[PDB]
Design a protein around this ligand. Structure first.
Ligand SMILES: CCCCCOc1ccc(S(N)(=O)=O)cc1
Ligand SMILES: CCCCCOc1ccc(S(N)(=O)=O)cc1
Ligand code: NA
Ligand code: NA
Ligand SMILES: [Zn+2]
Length: 257
């Protein structure tokens, strides 16, 4: 099965997922000087006040915080999007060291980690149908740098001990994802893909310019998770990021001048 090791990592994925070499793969490097300000881009509308988190799961690749997406509660609208996208889960990618971990890069800069808030287009009815469409998903990406602690992240950090290994989950209700945002909703946007297998080309990427700060202690706890299941040899869950992919025939557009 695919993973992030030398034997099964990003260089191998194309053998079982040939779209890995497709025309709109993610992540990409964001070249800030050539991303063009688009004054027709609308402000992002993030409506998370009614979000219903349910559970946190170590899936062997990251941890996912899952939401009740059986109704229009937490939704993303506006920005580059047409119509309404429902939040289904968030997760992170991070490094073994503070100098790497993000998937997107900014003028080749790697951040310590990257948060992905995953949403699906309600006009397709379910996430499974949305991932059969080129406009099925919208992922809001937020960079993490190491500095002061992020108070809204600490509830996540403090549950990780209970989901150390692949396949473990824990009840995780009443978590407010508004506590993970930065102040500004300035963003870059481009058409891309899932960054893990199956690498499907369904995503409108919306990457916020402003990183959130997290403390060294917070990200260190991410790095104590395990890729392996219980009873198996311990493999620290670190460096679960895909490198930047060729931009090909795409443009990145900035919401801000
Ligand atoms: C077993 O060994 C594998 C399995 C899957 C992959 S792959 N193409 O899904 O990364 C690579 C190696
Ligand atoms: C039909 C596949 C469902 C399982 C995979 O779902 C994903 C995978 C990657 C991302 S990401 N890193 O691009 O945000 C978001 C959702
Ligand atoms: Na451009
Ligand atoms: Na419901
Ligand atoms: Zn992701």
């Amino acid at each position: 099965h695919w993973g992030y090791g030398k034997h099964n990592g990003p260089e191998h994925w194309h053998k079982d997922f040939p779209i890995a070499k497709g025309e709109r793969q993610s992540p990409v490097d964001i070249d800030t000087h050539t991303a063009k300000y688009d004054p027709s881009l609308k402000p992002l509308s993030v409506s998370y006040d009614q979000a219903t988190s349910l559970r946190i799961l170590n899936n062997g690749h990251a941890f996912n915080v899952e939401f009740d997406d059986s109704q229009d509660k937490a939704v993303l609208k506006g920005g580059p999007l047409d119509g309404t996208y429902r939040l289904i889960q968030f997760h992170f990618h991070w490094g073994s060291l503070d100098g790497q971990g993000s998937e997107h890069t900014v003028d080749k800069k790697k951040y310590a980690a990257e948060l992905h808030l995953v949403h699906w287009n309600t006009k397709y009815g379910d996430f499974g149908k949305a991932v059969q469409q080129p406009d099925g998903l919208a992922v809001l990406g937020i960079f993490l740098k190491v500095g002061s602690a992020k108070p809204g992240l600490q509830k996540v950090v403090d549950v990780l001990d209970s989901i150390k290994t692949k396949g473990k989950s824990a009840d995780f209700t009443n978590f407010d994802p508004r506590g993970l945002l930065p102040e500004s909703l300035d963003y870059w946007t481009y058409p891309g893909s899932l960054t893990t297998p199956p690498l499907l080309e369904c995503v409108t990427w919306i990457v916020l310019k402003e990183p959130i700060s997290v403390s060294s202690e917070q990200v260190l706890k991410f790095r104590k998770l395990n890729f392996n299941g219980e009873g198996e040899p311990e493999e620290l869950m670190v460096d679960n990021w895909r490198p930047a992919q060729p931009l090909k025939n795409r443009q990145i557009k900035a919401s801000f001048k």
